[PDB]
């Protein structure tokens, strides 16, 4: 039917999962700023 | 700009359509059929109808009809009621109004340099409530419209709704110059 | 359609003033039976069924019993009860219980119906993706060239979003990666948002004017679960005496609400109770004899449907007194006439040819027309909302010039980060609440030991690793 | 089978126009306005030279907008955070109104040429819309009345048990009530008399589905009469 | 009279479900047919994501 034969609806552990790939992201994009202020104290 | 769109709130002539008459004043009679339902200047508030003895006598139109067999959803609520309480297009009266207000008060009240900017938000912001205005008003008459989808009705607009557009033209040009006065007064500070 | 009145039938007299499919079922017997034949109605009106406490059948059947009538044919369905006073046929019509409820308007696709070409687990892959891609050409771009120098380029972290954003919106962008591998992330996400945009762009038309029959109420078990719409059956009928005999937990949940309804839900006749589905708005049922059924739906105005299925399987019997000897040859009748195809040609010819309505004759509509503003308002409204927002946060940013993270603070801010990304990826993997689906469930392991069948599919708690209910 | 032929619809020197409603062709134009003037007000704000840092002044600001709708850009780019989010949203607006008008011209360039509402007798039979009625005393009423396939008997029970009554006088008659009731009448005439009504004025008529049989027309004679073998 | 007791009670309809569905050993176990305008699927665009 219309997605409702299994009404297949995602919990909160899906959910976490893609919480989780947020976070990574955002502490990649933490971490080489960082670098880049690392490499910059390295160059002056 | 607050004297257009006050008028195009106030008439009656935003719709022209086959609409309601005065035969059933509210609707709940026998046999009447509004005599085949003759041509209206359908209003925001009001449901005139030309053509007829009745011309320009009416009642207030109710926006949630008893007796069409529906039950409101939550998309169809909100549309309904914002449209039966027609907060968009008075909220642009009343920023239009708070605007004017300020541009009176920027011409005195020197060195404030900052109230000719408020102006020019509230005739922006003024604008933008307007369009949804409009929006809310299109799309709540597709609800109900006639025998054909949108087609039979013919719903013709009247100068009133041109008026509500005119408004927001000249609202927002009044917004850019507005603004073209704030940034000269920054370049003499 | 079993016995109705002529046009003319005022000034007609006798067996010409009924007219039917049962009136020419009754043609078909006497001339093979070689019988005369009187068409009379019964003054009750009734259909049969035992009357309370007083053991006298009422209608139809008492008419049977009682000595007054030689024959009944008639929709008179063969029960039990009925079978035990007077003897039946083999059955003429093949019938079901079913559910008859207010035609719903044709809903309109909502505010929102522009995101629904492409499903829920889809745009939400697009925009981890958007935000993968955007994250990756930083990282590649500003990574320590060998001052100003790292600052050549001009892909920070807000740019790589702009960028990323301006390829997927199909518009052209100020900036270009103007790097390998930088150019290897643009290129790869412009095919993405070329085959992307190609799929959503194929038939969005479609779906922004497409209309859905909302079906509020499939079948039996989703009537029994609100009290919203009622629902009741004729009065001395054959579908009363089957829920009240009935032992199925569903149709013990029906029969229970049946006696405790207030005002009586019982009509006592068809016509009130297609009268009382149209005039209800909705808020009522009717469980009726899906022949019947199926001609009301397909007759104007057209305001009713039946949704699902035949909860039972029944069938109408021409109907003779206990003991008669016309009874042996309509057996003899009703035989010779569904191998003769008669009784497939009767039914076949008052059925399909007196459709007489636009659901039955011509169910399909087509229509190519322009899109209006109704169908497409959302983006109107995200739009004027986008504006309203740009307009604040300007605002709200000349109140932050009117008026920095430390590197420790910095340090800080990752460290929760990493200890919040591990923790959360490790619940994920390690719980088992992922997807809420009906499934296999554990009354037993298997579902093939004497008709387990998943103990009724219950719904349940389904995870990565393994299923739970 | 005559029917009324359906209204012959002209396409407009506009028609390009069409597959969106004039209500929002007025609505995008307003949108086009609005947002605009608010790409204009971020940027052009209060500077904290540095006021002119964006190039996006009024008249910018509308090319970069109509550049934006046409799909085919401009070379300003707003740089600003709040004047990216107008700029993203406008973009996101273009997205789905223009393929809006893209998906719905492919269907208005895919329409089906159709002018039979109605067709061959099969479809007569099923549909309750439009009456069909013969000439009185004539061998399209007699043919109707002796016949045996499925679809000619369902045709002569209809035209017997309908108020008003289809049966006509006259042919002219016939042709009258068709163009009168505006394509809700059909008249059931022979393939010839439909060829040259269908060729005089005012050519309202359309001759659809085909030849339901074939039959002949002959020179009658009295029987016994000497003269039919001659004419022969 | 026992035919129509074990058809009242639905019994005959149990019967009949059980036996053919339920020692069949297909893996579909039922069919319907999907609407002519329905959205995608993940997996019908599965390729690109990869
Ligand atoms: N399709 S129908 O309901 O009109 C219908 C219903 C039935 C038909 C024939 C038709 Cl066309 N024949 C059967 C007959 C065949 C043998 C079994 C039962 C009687 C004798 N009865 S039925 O199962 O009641
Ligand atoms: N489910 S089914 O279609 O196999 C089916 C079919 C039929 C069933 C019971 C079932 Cl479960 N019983 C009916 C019975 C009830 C009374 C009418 C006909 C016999 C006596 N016969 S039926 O209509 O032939
Ligand atoms: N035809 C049915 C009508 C009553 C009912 O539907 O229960 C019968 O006589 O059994
Ligand atoms: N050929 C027909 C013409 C009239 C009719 O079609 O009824 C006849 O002579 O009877």
């Not at chain 2, 005119?166 to 850019?176: D, N, P, T």
């Amino acid at each position: 039917s219309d997605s409702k034969k299994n009404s297949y609806s995602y919990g909160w552990s899906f959910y976490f999962g893609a919480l989780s790939f947020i976070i990574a992201e955002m502490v990649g994009v933490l971490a080489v700023h960082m670098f880049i202020d690392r490499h910059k104290q390295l160059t002056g | 700009a607050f004297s257009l769109m006050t008028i195009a709130v106030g008439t009656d002539y935003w719709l022209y359509s086959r609409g309601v008459c005065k035969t059933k004043s509210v609707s709940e009679d026998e046999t009447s059929k509004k005599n085949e339902e003759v041509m209206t200047h359908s209003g925001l508030w009001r449901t005139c109808c030309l053509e007829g003895n009745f011309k320009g006598l009416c009642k207030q139109i109710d926006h949630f009809p008893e007796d069409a067999d529906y039950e409101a959803d939550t998309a169809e609520y909100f549309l309904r009621a914002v449209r039966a309480s027609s907060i968009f297009p008075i909220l642009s009266v009343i920023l239009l109004f708070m605007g004017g207000l300020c541009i009176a008060a920027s011409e005195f009240y020197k060195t404030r340099h900052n109230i000719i900017l408020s102006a020019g938000i509230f005739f922006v912001s003024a604008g933008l409530s307007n369009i949804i205005g409009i929006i809310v008003y299109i799309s709540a008459n597709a609800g109900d419209p006639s025998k054909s989808d949108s087609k039979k009705n013919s719903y013709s607009y009247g100068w009133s709704f041109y008026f509500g557009a005119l408004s927001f033209i000249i609202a927002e040009m009044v917004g850019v110059l507005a603004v073209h006065m704030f940034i000269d007064r920054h370049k003499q500070l | 359609p079993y016995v109705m009145m002529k046009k003319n039938h005022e000034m007609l007299e006798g067996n010409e003033r009924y007219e039917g499919y049962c009136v020419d079922l009754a043609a078909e017997i006497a001339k093979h039976c070689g019988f005369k034949y009187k068409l009379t109605i019964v003054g009750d009106g009734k259909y049969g069924a035992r009357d309370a406490d007083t053991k006298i059948w009422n209608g139809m059947v008492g008419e049977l019993v009682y000595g007054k009538a030689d024959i009944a044919i008639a929709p008179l369905t063969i029960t039990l009860v009925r079978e035990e006073v007077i003897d039946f046929s083999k059955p003429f019509m093949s019938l079901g219980i079913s559910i008859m409820i207010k035609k719903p308007q044709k809903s309109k696709p909502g505010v929102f119906s522009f995101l629904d070409p492409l499903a829920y687990e889809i745009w939400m892959c697009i925009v981890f993706a958007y935000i993968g891609v955007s994250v990756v050409l930083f990282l590649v771009s500003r990574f320590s060239p060998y001052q100003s120098s790292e600052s050549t380029n001009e892909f920070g972290i807000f740019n790589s979003l702009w960028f990323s954003l301006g390829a997927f919106m199909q518009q052209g962008c100020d900036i270009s990666p103007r790097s390998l591998s930088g150019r290897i992330v643009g290129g790869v996400w412009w095919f993405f948002t070329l085959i992307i945009i190609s799929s959503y762009t194929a038939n969005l038309a479609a779906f922004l004017t497409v209309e859905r029959m909302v079906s509020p109420i499939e079948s039996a078990e989703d009537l029994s679960k609100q009290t919203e719409i009622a629902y009741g059956t004729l009065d001395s009928g054959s579908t009363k005496e089957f829920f009240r005999r009935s032992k199925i937990a569903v149709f013990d949940k029906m029969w229970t609400y049946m006696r405790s309804a207030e005002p009586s839900v019982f009509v006592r006749t068809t016509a009130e109770g297609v009268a009382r589905v149209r005039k209800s708005k909705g808020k009522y049922a009717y469980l009726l004899e899906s022949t019947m059924n199926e001609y009301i739906e397909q007759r104007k105005p057209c305001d009713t449907m039946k949704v699902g299925g035949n909860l039972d399987s029944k069938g109408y019997g021409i109907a003779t007194p206990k003991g008669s000897s016309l009874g042996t040859p309509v057996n003899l009748a009703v035989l010779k006439l569904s191998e003769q195809g008669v009784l497939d040609k009767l039914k076949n010819k008052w059925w399909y040819d007196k459709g007489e309505c636009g659901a039955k004759d011509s169910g399909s509509k087509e229509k190519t027309s322009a899109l209006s503003l109704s169908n497409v308002a959302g983006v109107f409204y995200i739009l004027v909302g986008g504006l309203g927002l740009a307009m604040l946060v300007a605002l709200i940013e000349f109140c932050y010039k009117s008026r920095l993270f430390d590197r420790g603070v910095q340090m800080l801010l990752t460290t929760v980060g990493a200890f919040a990304a591990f923790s959360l990826m490790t619940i994920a993997v390690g719980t088992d609440y992922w997807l809420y689906s009906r499934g296999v469930c554990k009354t037993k392991s298997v579902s093939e030991d004497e008709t387990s069948k998943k103990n009724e599919e219950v719904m349940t708690h389904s995870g990565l690793w393994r299923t739970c209910c």
